[PDB]
Design a protein around this nucleic acid. Structure first.
Ligand SMILES: [Mg+2]
Length: 62
DNA sequence: CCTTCTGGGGAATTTTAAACCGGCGATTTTGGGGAAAAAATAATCGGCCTTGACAGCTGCACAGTAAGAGAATTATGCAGTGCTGCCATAACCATGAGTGATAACACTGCGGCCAACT
């Protein structure tokens, strides 16, 4: 967590290689699963559609 | 002309079939304890499938509001000086109490002297 939140490392291979020296012996799946929430949420592509009521909304832009 | 046979009906009795209720023998069910197996849940493992990024980099422009940095100005608090009055302290004498001092013995610290090694 310190690595992710202060060094900005999100490479599962790098973190796995680091902690393996510390003593970890398991696989990378648990690491990826634990680290997934910290990763940034990629923007969606689905786009909701809305139909405003008559004489109820207007939009402005430059 | 008469006698005997037979048939119907009411009353008494007997037997067998049916239904209920109780008693007796058997299985079931509930509870607790111990063992074994199944399944559920969580964690860990390997690997496949798919796609994002890496391609010079990001600083600036405008919009509005607010903050702040520097300089000038103003307000105020401290300080300085003079004169007068009041309170504190200090100076002396007396008496009591505490501590520094003095005597004596014992233990320890420091300086002078002797010897051993390089
Ligand atoms: Mg716009």
């Amino acid at each position: 967590q310190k690595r992710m939140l202060e060094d900005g490392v999100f490479n599962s291979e790098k973190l796995f290689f680091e902690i393996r020296q510390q003593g970890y012996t398991g696989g990378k799946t648990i690491l990826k699963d634990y680290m997934k929430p910290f990763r940034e949420t990629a923007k969606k592509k689905y786009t909701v559609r809305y139909e405003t009521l008559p004489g109820e909304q207007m939009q402005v832009d430059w």
